Design a protein around this ligand. Structure first.
Ligand SMILES: [Mg+2]
Ligand SMILES: [Mg+2]
Ligand SMILES: [Mg+2]
Ligand SMILES: [Mg+2]
Ligand SMILES: [Mg+2]
Ligand SMILES: [Mg+2]
Ligand SMILES: [Mg+2]
Ligand SMILES: [Mg+2]
Ligand SMILES: [Mg+2]
Ligand SMILES: [Mg+2]
Ligand SMILES: [Mg+2]
Ligand SMILES: [Mg+2]
Ligand SMILES: [Mg+2]
Ligand SMILES: [Mg+2]
Ligand SMILES: [Mg+2]
Ligand SMILES: [Mg+2]
Ligand SMILES: [Mg+2]
Ligand SMILES: [Mg+2]
Ligand SMILES: [Mg+2]
Ligand SMILES: [Mg+2]
Ligand SMILES: [Mg+2]
Lengths: 67, 55, 63, 143, 141, 145, 70, 206, 80, 60
RNA sequence: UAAUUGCGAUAACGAACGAGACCUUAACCUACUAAAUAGUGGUGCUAGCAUUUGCUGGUUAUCCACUUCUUAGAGGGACUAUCGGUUUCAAGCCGAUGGAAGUUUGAGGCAAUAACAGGUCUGUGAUGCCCUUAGACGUUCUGGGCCGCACGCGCGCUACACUGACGGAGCCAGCGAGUCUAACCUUGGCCGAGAGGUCUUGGUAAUCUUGUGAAACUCCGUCGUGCUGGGGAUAGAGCAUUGUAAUUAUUGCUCUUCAACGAGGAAUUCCUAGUAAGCGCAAGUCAUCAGCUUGCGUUGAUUACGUCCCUGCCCUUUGUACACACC
């Protein structure tokens, strides 16, 4: 599978919540974002996180998303 | 000794081969108890006093 | 041999309590305007072309 | 243009060289050859009977031509094939230390290999010459 | 020196190193012409890039390849890759680019991975069988 | 090699060393159906005797065959190395023989007897119909006898 | 030991007149024409080739292969 | 074909039928088309190759094995029964001989016959042990092309193997033989009979 | 001369597993109640500023049949 | 890598589980060209618990 | 979803343990820092063949340079990305393109609460209790035994051949190990058909054994379907090795002898890609002895990509007079 755990999804929510100006449709920049704006202990988890706080953006751009 | 060893009839493969095979050969694991394993046969017994003093 | 060509148009599912059998709707290409549902043996996807060896008859559930 | 042995395929080069030494007669050929088994890991003698020492000689030559230094131990191994332990799994086995060490001495007496320093045996100054020669003759058969 | 580059190929554990310099027009492997290389039935595998992208192309360059590790197939795949990777790097630094991109194109369109090395590799065995996936025979009682 | 011909010469089957030998088989291997003469022993004899190995038993001139035997029944004078031989260092005269034909049946017996006549455990163990070379006898060799 | 091992004069003469109409010829075809055990069959293939009569269009061990001449 | 000669020379016939056409061992891919609707798609031919040895990662996706060059498919399936596991170099060369053999008899692109031999032994309908409560009779099914092709290859190679077994004819021949006869199946083949009877049993119960 | 020993008081025994087992041991050898023992250690360790702590006692006290207890408080993780 | 491969069980019972411990040895070497003063200084200090330092000399 | 993995529903809202994260190994860096214990190009000294400049080698430092390949440090990289089908347009899933890599990326390591009268007192100078303690159940020494053979059961090895055996020839790995107060891994030279012996030698090791020239495999021959040259059991005779000792034959070599076995009833095991299977190798054991195992690399498929029919487990529902819990 590839269902993203709660830790991933919980951070993502928490980032989109308090930094929507800043952040984008681009994971490439959202990666670099997370580093400055968030303490995370692994490269891997950071990517797993940014990639999904990205995906979440990507469709807010077309309608809202609960949560 | 070795003298008796060979002279002795009653021996060698021929003689065994000719005899029938015991039935105990092709049997079982014999077991004897395995589903009485949880029923302690000590006859004894702790006691809620002792176990309370201990634990 | 009145062989018959039919184009798999939809994957519907696996019947047979084993499962090796796919329920499939097919469209003929030798005169379309009629579709019909057949049971396969092998691995199938959309646009495959079964050799319907009896143009008419069809199965449902297997056991 | 100029020609090597490395410019010619394994089989043909050796077979011509094997034929060459045979065509010649200067050699040295133990004498037990015909009754010997090439390796303990084998079943029957070579099928060439008269010959095959050449085939080895030629091979042995061609091999030490292609490199710095190799000796008895390395040559034993190379030629060693697998050996059916009857009802037991195969292992690889080393080959006769005698065929080779005598192929080594023999080909040297014929000047194709000198007992190199660093150990082993090395392609003689002369060998390069004569090897490259029948090598050349080998590609001439496709002229 | 002359204009040149070095490129490699890798299959399994074969790594095939290839030096490509401007030259008269050869292609030797470990120490021999490519018209041998036997393995053999495969030989058209390592011919492949030459003919893939036109015999000419090599008239201006020389090429050496030496392969270590690997095994009697592993190496044939490794070296074709390094040949064809080398032709497509030389042009990257020396000819023009639309050349290089033309060569990448004709190679990938054919391809048994000539430019990209196959990621596959032996998986560890684990205790309980004679193989990575295989398990030893069992019996119950 | 050579598309040959031959007149009537070649005869199928032939009898040497008290046995029967099939003519239309390679003479190295044809020689093997004699007891006490495995492939190695054969190949060396024929090499030695100077005969075309490529031939079948069938052709083989009668003087060739005659030489073949004479060497087989006397290997050590004709410079064959004894370690090539099935009975080095006898056990009485200490000579090096190479027992052949019906005499290998004859000489397996003598050896077996000598052990039993001496009550040696190997002997006893022979007389009992068992394995001797020290194999386990629980699981293996069950039918036999 | 069921016949094919030798060369019975009329045999060789057979293996001159009989090899035409052989669309395919190899070692294993010559055992099929109730004759020649593979060995002395293999020898034929070189000497059915001595002068034409067959064309080498394949190479080696295990497999040989020929066709009639032209 | 415009001659070219650099330092280390590439052979005439090598230089030749390469840069020209991309044809097989030395056989043509153009022509060679699948004489039965369906199977087309599920039988390769184009792109054309040199030898049927390919480190083909046809494995890790459900259908992509369809894309493997048919001739090479055919070879892969030659290399079985325990002892001959792996040993592709064996097979690869067995096919070489095989193809040449086919071609000698009855003309034809040998590769074309391999197609026809394939197309003609893949059974159009079959059977599968339907329950109905223990007493499992036989229900007729319409088998897919991918299974029609697979089962062909398997059926094809096998018969040759048992045929080749224990006897003077060599796999190369018998493999050719099966195909040759399966080109327009004359029921003197393991494969056709099996096909036929398997469509006999499917007809016997519907 | 070539070998030299110095002793060196450990900075809080409270966060050192080994130090506390030997406490636990030595507790029970003056006959402290099984819990009062362990249940104490966890409490002292905590006040030594551990994030979490666990004690098990296993085997047999006083009764005949063997038991085992757990004594945890605070936070632990168990994997990786 | 120093590998050690063992059954986990002290005895015999159970599915035969195997457990491989390993110990890794890391080795560098640094070549210097200095006189007697710096060397001896540079050897006695720089010390560290867990790193074995060895300083040879000579042109052979 | 592999996951109490999430989505969603929602008297719950929000969290922690376990899962995931993490860690190790295998993949990608012509980016970074370097290397006579890794290696490349040039240049000397030099061999051979052509000579027309060339081609193919020799040369632990005759110098210059370089880090592609090798090594291991620090970084980077992937997040199922882009796009699109799908779906409660949710988690997600499928396809295409690109990518070193897109099945938890592949394989592992660690792994909560609880259960079992699972196994181990024969690993422990761990241990309660019982037994025994000088004609000992202590210990040691000599010698036998654990291998004994009508036969039942289980893991294996080798096979029945022609995708073969044999004989020459090609000739390619990776994981490893290795001698101090000592005899470890052994190159090379000679003698020996062999096994081996003997003279020397490099290595406490990316430095030497070792490029571990391993095996399957590839090449050209011989044999031709014949229990055959498939197969090598059983057995005789000899020669060598380890060891104080080899008989009940430790192992190795040579000749010889040349069995069953012509693909195996009912049944049953294992497995989804560099996997299965074939194939050898190191390591553990080890004085000597692998038909075992733990790892390793070499050659490299067929068929799924599904389901609950069989079998095993889990989950709710439900019954219970069981709770020492259906023993
Ligand atoms: Mg070898
Ligand atoms: Mg060999
Ligand atoms: Mg077991
Ligand atoms: Mg005999
Ligand atoms: Mg035994
Ligand atoms: Mg085998
Ligand atoms: Mg956790
Ligand atoms: Mg984990
Ligand atoms: Mg680098
Ligand atoms: Mg792609
Ligand atoms: Mg119990
Ligand atoms: Mg214990
Ligand atoms: Mg025992
Ligand atoms: Mg062979
Ligand atoms: Mg001697
Ligand atoms: Mg020393
Ligand atoms: Mg026989
Ligand atoms: Mg044999
Ligand atoms: Mg060992
Ligand atoms: Mg064991
Ligand atoms: Mg209730």
């Amino acid at each position: 599978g590839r269902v993203r755990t709660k830790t991933v999804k919980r951070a993502s929510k928490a980032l989109i919540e308090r930094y929507y100006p800043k952040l984008t449709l681009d994971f490439q920049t959202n990666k670099r974002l997370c580093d400055e704006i968030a303490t995370i202990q692994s490269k891997r988890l950071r990517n797993k996180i940014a990639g999904y706080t990205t995906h979440l953006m990507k469709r807010i751009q077309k309608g809202p998303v609960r949560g | 000794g070795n003298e008796g060893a060979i002279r002795d009839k009653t021996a060698g493969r021929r003689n065994n081969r000719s005899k029938d095979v015991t039935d105990s050969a092709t049997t079982k694991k014999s077991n004897t108890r395995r589903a009485t394993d949880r029923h302690s046969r000590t006859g004894k017994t702790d006691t809620k006093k002792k176990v309370n003093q201990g634990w | 041999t009145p062989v018959t060509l039919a184009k798999v148009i939809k994957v519907l599912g696996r019947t047979g309590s084993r499962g090796g059998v796919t329920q499939v709707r097919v469209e003929f290409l030798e005169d379309t305007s009629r579709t019909i549902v057949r049971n396969v043996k092998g691995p199938v996807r959309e646009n495959d072309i079964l050799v319907l060896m009896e143009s008419e008859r069809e199965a449902r559930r297997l056991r | 243009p100029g020609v090597s042995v490395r410019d010619v395929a394994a089989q043909d080069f050796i077979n011509a060289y094997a034929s060459f030494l045979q065509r010649q007669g200067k050699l040295e050929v133990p004498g037990y050859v015909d009754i010997v088994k090439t390796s303990s890991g084998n079943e029957m003698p070579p099928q060439d009977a008269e010959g095959w020492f050449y085939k080895r000689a030629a091979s042995v030559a061609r091999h030490i031509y292609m490199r710095k230094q190799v000796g008895v131990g390395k040559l034993n191994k190379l030629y060693g094939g697998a050996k059916s332990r009857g009802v037991r799994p195969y292992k690889h086995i080393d080959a006769s230390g005698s065929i080779n060490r005598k192929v080594l001495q023999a080909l040297e007496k014929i000047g194709i290999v000198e007992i190199s320093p660093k150990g082993g045996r090395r392609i003689s100054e002369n060998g390069q010459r004569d090897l490259d020669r029948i090598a050349a003759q080998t590609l001439e058969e496709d002229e | 020196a002359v204009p040149s580059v070095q490129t490699f190929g890798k299959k399994k554990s074969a790594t095939a190193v290839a030096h490509v310099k401007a030259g008269k027009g050869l292609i030797k492997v470990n120490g021999s012409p490519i018209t041998l290389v036997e393995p053999e039935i495969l030989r058209f595998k390592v011919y492949e890039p030459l003919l893939l992208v036109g015999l000419d192309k090599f008239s201006n360059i020389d090429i050496r390849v030496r392969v270590t590790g690997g095994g009697h197939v592993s190496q044939v795949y490794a070296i074709r890759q390094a040949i064809a990777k080398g032709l497509v790097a030389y042009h990257q630094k020396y000819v023009d680019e639309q050349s290089k991109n033309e060569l990448k194109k004709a190679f990938t369109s054919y391809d048994r991975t000539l430019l990209i090395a196959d990621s596959r590799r032996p998986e560890p065995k684990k205790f309980g069988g004679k193989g990575a996936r295989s398990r030893f025979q069992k019996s119950y009682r | 090699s050579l598309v040959v011909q031959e007149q009537g010469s070649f005869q199928h089957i032939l009898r040497l060393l008290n046995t029967n030998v099939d003519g239309n088989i390679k003479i190295v291997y044809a020689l093997t159906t004699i007891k006490g003469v495995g492939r190695r022993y054969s190949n060396l004899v024929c090499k030695k005797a100077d005969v075309d190995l490529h031939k079948r038993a069938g052709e083989l001139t009668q003087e060739e065959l005659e030489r073949i035997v004479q060497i087989m029944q006397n290997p050590t004078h004709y410079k064959i190395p004894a370690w090539f031989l099935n009975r080095q260092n006898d056990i009485t005269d200490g000579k090096d023989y190479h027992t052949l034909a019906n005499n290998v049946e004859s000489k397996l017996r003598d050896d077996l007897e000598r052990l039993k006549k001496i009550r040696a455990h190997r002997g006893i163990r022979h007389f009992w119909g068992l394995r001797v070379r020290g194999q386990h006898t629980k699981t293996t060799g069950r039918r036999r006898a | 030991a069921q016949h094919a091992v030798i060369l019975d004069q009329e045999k060789y003469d057979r293996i001159l007149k009989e090899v035409p109409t052989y669309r395919y010829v190899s070692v294993s075809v010559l055992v099929d024409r109730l004759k020649i055990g593979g060995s002395l069959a293999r020898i034929a293939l070189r000497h059915l080739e001595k002068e034409g009569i067959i064309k080498p269009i394949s190479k080696h061990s295990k497999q040989a292969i020929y066709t009639r001449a032209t | 074909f415009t001659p070219v000669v650099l330092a280390t020379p590439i052979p005439e016939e090598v230089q030749q039928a390469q840069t020209e056409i991309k044809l097989f061992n030395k056989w043509s891919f153009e022509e060679v088309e699948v004489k039965d609707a369906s199977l087309v798609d599920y039988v390769q031919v184009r792109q054309p190759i040199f030898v049927a040895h390919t480190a083909g990662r046809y494995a890790n996706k459900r259908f992509r094995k369809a894309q493997c060059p048919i001739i090479e498919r055919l070879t892969n399936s030659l290399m079985m029964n325990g002892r001959n596991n792996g040993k592709k170099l064996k097979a690869v060369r067995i096919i070489k001989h095989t193809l040449d053999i086919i071609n000698v008899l009855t003309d034809q692109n040998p590769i074309q016959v391999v197609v026809d031999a394939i197309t003609n032994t893949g059974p159009r309908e079959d059977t599968t042990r339907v329950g109905g409560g223990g007493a499992a009779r036989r229900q007729a099914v319409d088998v897919s092309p991918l299974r029609r092709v697979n089962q062909a290859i398997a059926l094809l190679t096998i018969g040759a193997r048992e045929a080749a077994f224990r006897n003077i004819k060599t796999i190369a021949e018998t493999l050719a033989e099966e195909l040759i006869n399966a080109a327009k199946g004359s029921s003197t083949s393991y494969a056709i009979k099996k096909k036929d009877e398997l469509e006999r049993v499917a007809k016997s119960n519907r | 001369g070539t070998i030299v020993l110095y002793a060196e008081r450990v900075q809080d025994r409270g966060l050192s597993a080994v130090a506390q087992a030997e406490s636990m041991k030595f507790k029970l050898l003056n006959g402290l109640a099984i819990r009062r023992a362990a249940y104490g250690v966890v409490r002292y360790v905590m006040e030594s500023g551990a994030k979490g702590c666990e004690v098990v006692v296993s085997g047999k006290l006083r009764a005949a049949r063997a038991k085992a207890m757990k004594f945890a408080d605070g936070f632990l993780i168990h994997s990786g | 890598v120093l590998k050690i491969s063992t059954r986990k069980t002290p005895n015999g019972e159970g599915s035969k589980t195997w457990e491989t411990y390993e110990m890794r040895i890391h080795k560098r070497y640094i070549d210097l060209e200095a006189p007697v003063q710096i060397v001896k200084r540079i050897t006695q200090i720089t010390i560290e618990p867990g790193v074995d330092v060895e300083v040879v000399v000579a042109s052979n």
